[PDB]
Design a protein around this ligand. Structure first.
Ligand SMILES: *CC[C@H]1/C(=C/c2[nH]c(/C=C3N=C(/C=C4\NC(=O)C(CC)=C4C)C(C)=C\3CCC(=O)O)c(CCC(=O)O)c2C)NC(=O)[C@@H]1C
Ligand SMILES: *[C@@H](C)[C@H]1/C(=C/C2=NC(=C\c3[nH]c(C[C@H]4NC(=O)C(C=C)=C4C)c(C)c3CCC(=O)O)/C(CCC(=O)O)=C2C)NC(=O)[C@@H]1C
Ligand SMILES: *[C@@H](C)[C@H]1/C(=C/C2=NC(=C\c3[nH]c(C[C@H]4NC(=O)C(C=C)=C4C)c(C)c3CCC(=O)O)/C(CCC(=O)O)=C2C)NC(=O)[C@@H]1C
Ligand SMILES: *[C@@H](C)[C@H]1/C(=C/C2=NC(=C\c3[nH]c(C[C@H]4NC(=O)C(C=C)=C4C)c(C)c3CCC(=O)O)/C(CCC(=O)O)=C2C)NC(=O)[C@@H]1C
Ligand SMILES: *[C@H](C)[C@H]1/C(=C/C2=NC(=C\c3[nH]c(C[C@H]4NC(=O)C(C=C)=C4C)c(C)c3CCC(=O)O)/C(CCC(=O)O)=C2C)NC(=O)[C@@H]1C
Ligand SMILES: *[C@H](C)[C@H]1/C(=C/C2=NC(=C\c3[nH]c(C[C@H]4NC(=O)C(C=C)=C4C)c(C)c3CCC(=O)O)/C(CCC(=O)O)=C2C)NC(=O)[C@@H]1C
Ligand SMILES: *[C@H](C)[C@H]1/C(=C/C2=NC(=C\c3[nH]c(C[C@H]4NC(=O)C(C=C)=C4C)c(C)c3CCC(=O)O)/C(CCC(=O)O)=C2C)NC(=O)[C@@H]1C
Ligand SMILES: C=CC1=C(C)[C@@H](Cc2[nH]c(/C=C3N=C(/C=C4\NC(=O)[C@H](C)[C@H]4CC)C(C)=C\3CCC(=O)O)c(CCC(=O)O)c2C)NC1=O
Ligand SMILES: C=CC1=C(C)[C@@H](Cc2[nH]c(/C=C3N=C(/C=C4\NC(=O)[C@H](C)[C@H]4CC)C(C)=C\3CCC(=O)O)c(CCC(=O)O)c2C)NC1=O
Ligand SMILES: CCC1=C(C)/C(=C/C2=NC(=C\c3[nH]c(/C=C4\NC(=O)[C@H](C)[C@H]4CC)c(C)c3CCC(=O)O)/C(CCC(=O)O)=C2C)NC1=O
Ligand SMILES: CCC1=C(C)/C(=C/C2=NC(=C\c3[nH]c(/C=C4\NC(=O)[C@H](C)[C@H]4CC)c(C)c3CCC(=O)O)/C(CCC(=O)O)=C2C)NC1=O
Ligand SMILES: CCC1=C(C)/C(=C/C2=NC(=C\c3[nH]c(/C=C4\NC(=O)[C@H](C)[C@H]4CC)c(C)c3CCC(=O)O)/C(CCC(=O)O)=C2C)NC1=O
Lengths: 380, 160, 177, 92, 130, 26, 172, 164, 160
């Protein structure tokens, strides 16, 4: 039993943060929970208002000429009768929101943006998308914003005083839906005006189509390609800055590939993962030279004990026996330090590291070979 | 293998094998069935050899297992018998090969550097080999023990 | 929220004054007793865990009716919650000691804390006794007169910090009263 | 100590190859060549490998590379693997 | 039975010849900087400039270099409005010294491989002096 | 090395004397 | 006799100038050195008997002709006067180390010491060997930790070596 | 991580402001407090194997029930993986002293430790009886300076506060 | 000696000594007073350095003097300390000669062959010299105990 409750449930009375957030990517980056305190200074009402305009507009840039329509609902928050969940309801029902994300958007793109902005959650399966389409056609835009917020999910996750954030939930109910979140919040330096093509399709930046890619992955249950999760991603904004020996970062697609060097790489991963299957099996029994004598060497050393440390005279000279737990076994400081160097010393781990350096290189060399007819080649 | 050592001496002279050097191989391959029996009877007595040969090493050198000794503790005496098991393995190679060059290139060249780097008394290692030779030779006839006794004694010389 | 240097600007702004050579005297005393302030905040957050269970368990040993059936520290769900909010109160107190002003203890933590405990059912008279035990420990660590933990300081006296922090604990003892 | 002490024509030492190496020079090349014997058919000595790749010091490359040419050999490649280029001092 | 055998003959070996082909010290198959670039067929403009400017004399030296030769598409990308203002006068037949300082900036002393530069920021001085 | 005999070191009186009234030290 | 602080004031008064802000900060860092300077003076006076009697014992080993009959340090009074001069020089060098200025050392220890040793016939080159043997015996005793916190005393030990060198050229 | 620099650049970037004057002032306090805590990191780098050995057998002398069959010290392989864990916690404290704040102990040594010690049945009192031993062995003028012993015993108590 | 190595090195090239080579001879004769004094301080502490050194060696290596060890018995332990006196005498020659060449030409060339033939553990002779180094280095000053210790560490490196 590792986790005890998910983030879709309310927090228990004995915790500050939730449990699934404590070892997630939540602790590592900017996608955290900003809460408004009980009594707010006007300087720290900006720290809550700049975080709302980050999330709810999805890194769109509100000019001050067009922040002037929001001063009526800003001041109703700065007074203090609109909570954060009621400010974002009126901000979604605004005019500057419907111009940006509704009035040129296909209905798939508007729902997946409302799933990104109001909830911290890319759209999970298909019949959830379908039922949220099937209010707007029957009830209009007005009641459909009450679908996301006036259900159990917003109250259990954000309450009424937290600004929405992209949730790194730990447990994902399809495991595909972790990929959707990384394909939708795709970059710190990105925004939905760019990802939806809403600046290049129109005239001087206005009149854009907010058209969606990855529509077919909603209907047909199909995974996201791994490039859209590893190269322009929240995982690079929340990068752990580890030493990882299989480094997950997507290398740049090279110019000047050749089908010769792909065939040598494709062959050598078959030499490595066939070797891995015959070395994993060989290990766990006969890997250790000093293991068959352990029961014979453990029955030989079990006599001549000195309780008041400083016995074993061996003549009249003195010997300084120490009764530590480690040194009673005959071990040194290098006995526990050997577990740290087993990456370039083990034969089972050297194979697996060398295998996945190669499928890293093969996944980007193959994909650069997906290019065609007028290609100029090289001599290595 | 004497077949290997017998060809390298002929190529150095740049000539075919002499009529005498050919008699070496047929007299060696003739005794192949005998060497397989000798080395095999030692293989079936590993625990009786390396354990008995090891405990006797702890009576003639009680300091290697006392506090401050190299083989003090459960692990250093477990690594203790590991070295003895290596050398009994190499002696069976030399018997089937008819040469000490298997033992020489595996465990005799650079042995003083390895053990000096580990702090292990080389005089205590050869004492365990002299104790394994008595356990080994006691399970074989005098006809065979005098033959296998050379491979044990050859390693003692190089280990000093 | 505010600290010590911002209070003397807020006070000197309703009178539209510059902050000159007279008002700079309480602040030069603040920046010269600064190493004594960090040495006192370090001495409190370094014992933060053991102070709270010292205090909640003292709240039980004097009052056995808190662990009785239906008591507010009955299950493990409720006993752990009482150890949680003890750690929040000591956290917001030790914020105000570091700044030099209770302007952050009184608007984040203490503002609305009393009426919250009424909606839950937390007894206030026993939760006073917890903060009072925590006050006895925080003034014991600052003055280095804890009987079982001697931190190592340079020689001097911190009686004003031991009385600045006692008033911070009495605000918590007066707000939820 | 070095090969360029002025010894040339009309000196007491016989005429030989003179190198431009300093005293205890430490530059070495990496050469590759083939050198047939061209005398085995009247001496009848053993057969030896004539395809060589070895590191040769700067101090002897003039004499070696001039001896391989006299004896019909063919030099296939030469590179400098140790030392600097156009260094004034620091070749020792 | 292993994964990474060791090379050598005789007793205590694995069955792999010394150096994987009985060649302990193998001969150099690689070729010079100026001709390995002319062979690929994409460093056409670059190598032609090294011969016309005179920088080819030091690109062939034995000194371990780390060249950053630009592809033929890079030299064709100089038609940008900005970069053209800076380098359009290098086309004049009298500005050869200015071309040598712009070319010699790509020859770095030392052998920096793409794997040694992983997660490391290094600063050096080019053969031009900057 | 050392100041002249009797002159306390570092406390000379000809330190900043102007040229027009400087007296050579015997 | 004036210390390092009064040396700055004595130069400023002959200019008629106030001390500028770059001179006060050079004096506020002499105060910041401070405790490290008193640790050096404490270490060379606590061992002051051992510095003299070891450097003397090492001086007649290298030059045995000084204690032969006819040498300059052969008798009881001529040997005691040899150890006396080394304690005087070591006393005044520690006065210049606590002052930060060599003014007291050449005011009343080094004025006429060269002409004194020429009058007596004392070999002044061998007296300079004895100052240098006391120098490194106390330089090595300044930069060992032994009850001091770990830090950099490198500029102060270079200052202490300068006083021992000034006394060793003002003697021959 | 969590350093002095990372808190003043992430609070700035949340606001959208350049490095302000109160930012460069806080990095000056990183210059004054530096040589105290870079003096305790070097004392830990050159003497850790003697600290970890003495801190490790304090765990087994205090609780000798661990060496029973069934517990977390039943053979030589688990005992080596015990002294290894003390050398991990001691190496992270050396990393915290070099960075400046509690960056490395949070993301590499705490964030999940409440879970991996429950499933593997590792008792956590046995972890803290090794860390509390080293905090009580600190003789503050002998081992290091007096201000280094504050910076050293601060992360030692930060860790005991997180595991208890 | 420093002078010898400069003369033989300039003879292999068939030329005169250079100013850099003559400075090393001037710099060496200047330190002749300090070298003659340091060697004298060690020669006056023979019985303490030797007896003190062999006393500590038998606590770090109690097996060499126990029953079965090489130096078992009064006559053997007497010759035990006799060897330590050889290397202390050689160290005084190196300090005065200005280099370690007397220690090498006398008692370091063939030392592993000598001690392997006598049955003596060479690792014990290097442990006994390391104990004499601590005793001899406790009788000297700050910088005179540093260089004298280098002559003791050279002998141990060449004895392993
Ligand atoms: C080991 C030292 C070397 C040495 C010393 C030596 N000195 C003397 C005699 C005198 N030294 C002084 C010195 C001082 N007088 C001062 O007032 C001061 C402070 C300003 C000093 C440092 C004086 C006055 C004398 C002569 C009077 C006396 O006897 O005290 C002597 C004795 C000479 C004699 O003939 O009596 C010795 C031996 N000589 C050496 O050989 C050492 C190298
Ligand atoms: C009262 C609680 C104590 C006490 C306090 C004193 N502390 C004094 C000096 C002091 N404390 C520190 C560490 C502090 N400064 C920092 O920068 C940080 C963290 C970043 C901390 C925790 C320092 C550096 C100093 C200065 C002395 C030193 O160099 O160690 C002090 C002296 C007064 C002063 O210097 O201002 C006092 C009185 N002392 C006590 O005895 C009670 C119990
Ligand atoms: C260089 C000689 C040493 C070294 C010296 C340091 N000492 C430091 C502080 C310090 N020094 C003293 C000695 C001195 N001060 C006095 O008041 C008296 C007696 C009246 C003496 C003899 C004291 C008392 C102190 C304590 C000051 C304090 O800590 O408050 C010091 C700086 C401390 C630090 O930064 O850790 C240094 C560097 N240290 C060395 O490594 C060499 C060997
Ligand atoms: C000995 C005094 C301890 C004790 C230790 C054991 N730990 C075991 C496994 C283990 N420990 C950790 C945490 C550790 N690894 C890290 O990388 C870091 C920080 C960088 C830390 C603190 C992990 C992740 C694991 C599992 C993987 C592994 O083997 O390292 C362990 C083995 C238990 C088992 O195999 O069932 C032991 C015995 N046990 C004790 O009794 C005290 C608490
Ligand atoms: C353990 C046996 C593996 C291993 C696992 C790691 N997984 C890490 C993050 C992570 N793991 C999952 C899988 C799981 N979570 C789910 O929600 C679902 C399905 C609904 C599954 C199967 C996911 C989706 C993620 C990413 C989500 C997140 O991080 O919040 C992880 C941490 C990596 C990191 O911090 O960068 C590890 C180490 N790793 C192993 O070595 C063994 C083979
Ligand atoms: C312990 C000394 C008390 C006690 C505490 C209980 N509190 C319970 C719930 C609860 N506690 C707080 C206080 C805390 N949260 C904050 O945000 C702040 C200030 C910033 C503080 C001090 C709150 C707000 C709540 C309710 C909401 C929540 O749990 O998150 C609680 C649980 C009651 C239950 O299980 O029904 C307990 C037992 N109770 C006691 O008897 C002593 C006196
Ligand atoms: C400068 C690049 C020279 C140089 C000259 C030095 N002069 C020193 C002292 C000094 N200078 C003067 C002449 C000065 N006083 C005046 O009133 C006028 C003209 C109106 C001038 C040029 C005098 C009379 C004195 C002696 C009085 C005094 O000490 O102030 C001097 C210090 C000498 C010393 O203390 O022994 C120097 C170093 N300095 C140089 O290095 C080059 C040669
Ligand atoms: C019925 C149960 C019961 C208890 C548990 C104690 C709890 C307790 N301790 C103190 C008093 C104190 N309590 C602590 C707390 C601690 N001491 C430490 O060193 C640790 C950090 C921490 C325990 C983990 C400290 C430091 C003092 C001050 C005196 C001292 O211990 O040095 C006080 C108030 C003052 C007093 O009574 O004198 C109380 C109620 N008393 C009880 O009646
Ligand atoms: C990283 C920081 C760090 C430390 C704190 C020490 C911790 C430490 N101290 C000692 C060793 C010691 N420590 C002390 C100190 C004391 N004993 C007392 O009774 C007094 C209360 C206290 C003075 C403050 C003494 C006297 C010894 C030597 C005797 C002993 O080992 O107990 C040892 C044994 C090896 C040694 O001598 O150093 C170790 C590991 N080492 C470190 O690397
Ligand atoms: C087949 C050729 C061959 C040999 C012989 C060999 C020996 C060898 N002996 C070792 C250690 C060791 N060897 C000993 C040996 C001894 N202790 C004593 O008291 C005796 C004198 C002596 C004989 C038992 C000990 C105690 C260790 C462990 C040292 C340590 O853990 O530090 C080790 C290091 C750990 C390991 O086994 O990987 C190697 C490699 N390797 C080889 O390839
Ligand atoms: C008989 C056929 C033949 C030739 C010609 C030959 C040349 C030859 N020239 C060399 C060097 C050299 N050659 C020169 C030559 C010149 N510098 C200039 O500026 C001029 C352009 C040029 C004179 C015309 C220089 C300067 C060196 C030394 C290079 C250095 O030290 O870096 C070397 C390296 C070894 C040595 O210098 O001793 C060889 C082997 N070898 C042969 O077998
Ligand atoms: C100047 C260079 C030099 C050296 C070093 C030297 C050594 C030397 N050591 C000898 C014996 C010996 N050496 C030892 C030595 C030791 N026993 C121990 O336990 C220790 C580990 C070890 C060092 C103290 C013993 C015990 C003997 C007598 C062996 C015997 O009688 O069986 C002998 C034979 C008897 C004699 O002539 O004295 C020589 C010649 N000769 C030289 O010319």
């Amino acid at each position: 039993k590792v986790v005890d409750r998910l983030d879709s449930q309310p927090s228990a009375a004995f915790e500050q943060t939730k449990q699934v957030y404590t070892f997630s990517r939540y602790i590592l980056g900017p996608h955290r929970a900003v809460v408004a305190p009980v009594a707010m200074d006007p300087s720290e009402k900006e720290v809550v208002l700049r975080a709302v305009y980050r999330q709810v507009f999805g890194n769109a840039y509100i000019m001050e000429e067009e922040r002037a329509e929001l001063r009526v609902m800003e001041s109703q928050f700065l007074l203090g009768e609109l909570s954060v969940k009621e400010l974002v309801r009126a901000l979604a029902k605004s005019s500057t929101y419907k111009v940006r994300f509704f009035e040129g958007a296909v209905q798939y793109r508007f729902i997946e943006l409302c799933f990104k902005h109001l909830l911290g959650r890319a759209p999970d399966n298909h019949e959830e998308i379908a039922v949220h389409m099937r209010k707007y056609q029957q009830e209009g835009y007005d009641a459909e914003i009450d679908s996301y917020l006036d259900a159990g999910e917003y109250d259990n996750v954000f309450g009424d005083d937290t600004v929405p954030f992209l949730r790194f939930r730990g447990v994902y109910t399809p495991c595909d839906s972790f990929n959707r979140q990384c394909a939708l919040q795709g970059g710190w330096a990105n925004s939905d005006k760019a990802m939806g093509g809403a600046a290049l399709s129109g005239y001087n930046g206005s009149d854009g189509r907010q058209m969606s890619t990855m529509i077919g992955n909603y209907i047909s249950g199909k995974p996201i390609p791994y490039e859209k999760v590893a190269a322009d991603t929240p995982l690079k904004s929340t990068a752990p800055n580890w030493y990882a020996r299989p480094n997950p970062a997507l290398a740049p697609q090279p110019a000047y590939v050749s089908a010769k060097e792909i065939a040598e790489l494709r062959s050598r991963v078959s030499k490595l993962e066939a070797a891995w299957s015959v070395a994993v099996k060989q290990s766990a029994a006969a890997k250790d030279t000093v293991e068959t004598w352990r029961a014979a060497a453990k029955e030989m050393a079990a006599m001549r004990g000195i309780s008041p440390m400083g016995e074993a005279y061996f003549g009249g000279i003195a010997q300084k026996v120490d009764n530590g737990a480690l040194a009673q076994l005959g071990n040194k400081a290098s006995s526990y330090k050997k577990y740290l160097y087993a990456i370039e010393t083990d034969e089972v781990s050297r194979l697996e590291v060398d295998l996945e350096e190669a499928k890293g290189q093969l996944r980007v060399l193959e994909a650069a070979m997906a290019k065609s007819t007028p290609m100029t080649r090289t001599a290595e | 293998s004497i077949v290997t050592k017998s060809i390298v001496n002929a190529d150095a002279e740049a000539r075919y094998l002499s009529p005498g050097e050919l008699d070496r191989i047929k007299s060696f391959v003739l005794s192949g069935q005998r060497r397989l029996r000798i080395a095999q009877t030692l293989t079936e007595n590993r625990e009786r050899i390396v354990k008995q040969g090891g405990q006797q090493l702890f009576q003639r050198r009680p300091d290697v297992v006392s506090p401050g000794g190299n083989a003090y503790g459960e692990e250093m005496t477990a690594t203790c018998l590991r070295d003895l098991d290596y050398y009994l393995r190499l002696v069976t190679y030399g018997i089937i090969a008819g040469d000490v060059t298997p033992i020489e290139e595996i465990g005799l060249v650079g042995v003083k550097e390895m053990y000096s780097a580990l702090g292990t008394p080389i005089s205590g290692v050869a004492e365990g080999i002299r104790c394994m030779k008595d356990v080994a030779c006691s399970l074989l006839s005098g006809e065979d023990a005098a033959e296998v006794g050379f491979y044990f004694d050859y390693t003692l010389a190089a280990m000093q | 929220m505010l600290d010590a240097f911002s209070r003397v600007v807020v006070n000197s702004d309703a009178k539209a004054a510059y902050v000159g050579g007279s008002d700079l005297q309480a602040l030069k005393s603040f920046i010269a007793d600064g190493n004594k302030r960090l040495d006192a905040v370090n001495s409190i957050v370094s014992n933060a865990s053991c102070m709270v269970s010292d205090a909640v368990s003292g709240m039980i040993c004097e009052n056995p009716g808190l662990i009785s059936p239906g008591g507010n520290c009955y299950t493990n769900r409720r006993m752990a919650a009482c150890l949680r909010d003890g750690e929040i109160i000591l956290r917001y107190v030790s914020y105000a000691l570091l700044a030099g002003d209770a302007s952050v203890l009184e608007d984040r933590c203490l503002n609305g804390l009393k009426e919250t405990y009424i909606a839950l059912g937390v007894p206030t008279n026993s939760s006073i006794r917890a903060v009072s035990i925590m006050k006895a420990q925080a003034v014991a660590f600052i003055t280095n007169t804890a009987t079982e933990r001697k931190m190592s300081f340079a020689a001097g006296d911190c009686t004003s910090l031991a009385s600045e922090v006692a008033s911070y604990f009495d605000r918590v003892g007066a707000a939820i009263s | 100590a070095y090969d360029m002490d002025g010894t040339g024509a009309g000196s007491l030492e016989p005429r030989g190859i003179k190198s431009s190496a300093v005293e205890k020079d430490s530059r070495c090349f990496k050469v590759t060549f083939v050198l047939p014997s061209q005398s085995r058919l009247y001496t009848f000595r053993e057969l030896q490998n004539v395809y060589t790749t070895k590191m040769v010091p700067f101090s002897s490359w003039y004499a070696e590379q001039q001896r391989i040419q006299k004896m019909g050999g063919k030099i296939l490649k030469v590179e400098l693997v140790a030392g600097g280029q156009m260094r004034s001092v620091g070749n020792q | 039975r292993t994964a990474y055998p060791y090379t050598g003959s005789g007793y205590g070996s694995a069955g792999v010849p010394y150096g994987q082909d009985t060649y302990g010290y193998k001969a150099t198959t690689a070729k010079s900087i100026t001709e390995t670039a002319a062979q690929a067929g994409v460093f056409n403009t670059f190598v032609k400039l090294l011969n016309e400017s005179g920088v080819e004399k030091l690109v062939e030296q034995a000194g371990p270099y780390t060249v950053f030769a630009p592809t033929d598409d890079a030299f064709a990308a100089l038609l940008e409005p900005h970069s053209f203002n800076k380098l359009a006068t290098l086309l004049r037949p009298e500005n050869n010294d200015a071309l040598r300082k712009v070319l010699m900036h790509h020859v770095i002393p030392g052998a920096f491989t793409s794997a040694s530069l992983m997660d490391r920021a290094v600063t050096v001085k080019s053969l031009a002096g900057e | 090395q050392l100041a002249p005999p009797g002159i306390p070191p570092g406390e000379d009186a000809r330190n900043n004397q102007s040229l027009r009234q400087y007296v050579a030290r015997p | 006799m004036l210390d390092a602080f009064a040396k700055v004031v004595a130069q400023a008064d002959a200019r008629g100038e106030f001390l500028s802000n770059t001179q006060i900060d050079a004096l506020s860092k002499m105060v910041k050195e401070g405790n490290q300077r008193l640790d050096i003076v404490n270490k060379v006076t606590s061992n002051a008997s051992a510095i003299v009697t070891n450097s003397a014992r090492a001086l007649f080993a290298e030059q045995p002709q000084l204690i032969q009959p006819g040498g300059n340090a052969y008798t009881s009074r001529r040997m005691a006067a040899c150890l006396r001069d080394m304690e005087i020089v070591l006393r005044y060098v520690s006065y210049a180390m606590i002052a930060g200025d060599s003014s007291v050392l050449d005011d009343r220890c080094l004025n006429g010491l060269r002409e004194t040793y020429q009058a007596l016939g004392t070999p002044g080159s061998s007296v300079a060997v004895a100052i240098q043997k006391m120098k490194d015996a106390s330089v090595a005793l300044a930069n060992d930790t032994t009850g001091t916190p770990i830090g950099d005393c490198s500029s102060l030990v270079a200052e202490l070596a300068g006083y021992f060198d000034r006394a060793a050229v003002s003697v021959v | 991580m969590k350093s002095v620099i990372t808190t003043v650049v992430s609070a700035a970037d949340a606001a959208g402001r350049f490095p302000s004057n109160s930012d460069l002032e806080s990095i000056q306090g990183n210059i004054q407090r530096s040589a105290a805590r870079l003096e305790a990191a070097e004392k830990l780098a050159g003497n850790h194997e003697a600290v970890v050995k003495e801190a490790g057998d304090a765990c087994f002398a205090k609780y000798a029930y661990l060496k029973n069959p069934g517990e977390a010290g039943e053979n030589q392989e688990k005992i080596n993986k015990c002294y290894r864990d003390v050398d991990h916690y001691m190496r992270l404290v050396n990393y915290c002293l070099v960075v400046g704040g509690t960056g490395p102990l949070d993301e590499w040594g705490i964030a999940g430790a409440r879970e991996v010690y429950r499933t593997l049945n590792l008792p956590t009192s046995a972890y803290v009886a090794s860390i509390a031993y080293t905090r009580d062995r600190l003789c503050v003028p002998r081992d290091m300076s007096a201000q280094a012993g504050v910076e050293f015993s601060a992360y030692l108590d930060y860790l005991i506060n997180a595991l208890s």
